[PDB]
């Protein structure tokens, strides 16, 4: 449903967030959380809609988002899950906050207008 300009903007933002530039604090957020492999077996007692950057990218690439608000919701869900599960002071929590700061900076430039 999304037009080309907004779609391209979102794909760019997500790929930048997954880019090597941010490797130092984005790596817990590229793929879906695996509770057992990470020794966090209670993960899905705290989180009910898992989300990750790779997932948002895949949904974008399949034209699954009608609009920037839906894409923004999934992306913010990444960080909301992060903070719901990782207590204050944990390394993953702090990486999540850092990644959200970068996301907000990039997103403030979002296309305000669409037109076909
Ligand atoms: C999001 C969240 O809420 N979690 C809950 C608590 C928690 N604890 C962790 C400890 C370690 C890791 C981890 O090692 N992730 C990791 C991912 C990818 C790679 N690579 C493979 C390919 O890409 C290049 C490198 C290396 C590592 C992740 C976590 C999480 C996730």
> Where in the sequence is the domain holding 22, given as residue range(s)?
4-107
Q: Is residue 115 part of a domain?
A: no
Q: Is residue 81 part of a domain?
A: yes
CATH number at residue 42: 1.20.920.10
CA of 33 relative to ligand 1 center, distance in Å: 7
Residue with tokens 């449903």: 1
Exposure of 40 by Cβ count < 10 A (0-12 exposed, 13-18 middle, 19+ buried)? middle
Q: Is residue 35 part of a domain?
A: yes
Tell me the technique behind this structure: X-ray
Of 19, 26, 28, which is best to mutate to test ligand 1, by the most ligand atoms within 8 angstroms of its C-beta?
A: 28
Q: Is residue 33 part of a domain?
A: yes
Q: Is residue 83 part of a domain?
A: yes
Q: Is residue 77 part of a domain?
A: yes
Q: How far apart are CA 30 and CA 91, in angstroms?
A: 16
Q: Is residue 114 part of a domain?
A: no
* Sequence-ordered list of residues with C-beta below 8 angstroms from that of 94, at least 6 positions apart, any chain: 25
* Sequence-ordered list of residues with C-beta below 8 angstroms from that of 83, at least 6 positions apart, any chain: 93, 96, 97
Q: Is residue 58 part of a domain?
A: yes
User: How many domains does the chain contain in total?
Assistant: 1
Structure resolution, Å: 2.1
């Amino acid at each position: 449903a999304m037009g080309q300009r907004a779609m391209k903007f979102c794909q760019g933002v997500v790929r930048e967030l997954m880019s090597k530039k941010y490797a130092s604090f984005n790596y817990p957020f590229l793929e879906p959380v695996d509770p057992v492999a990470l020794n966090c077996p209670t993960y899905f007692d705290y989180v009910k809609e898992p989300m990750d950057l790779g997932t948002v990218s895949k949904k974008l690439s399949n034209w699954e988002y009608e609009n920037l608000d839906q894409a923004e919701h999934d992306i913010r869900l990444i960080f909301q899950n992060c903070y719901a599960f990782n207590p204050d002071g944990t390394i993953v929590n702090m990486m999540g906050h850092r990644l959200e700061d970068i996301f907000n900076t990039k997103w403030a430039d979002r296309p305000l207008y669409s037109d076909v």
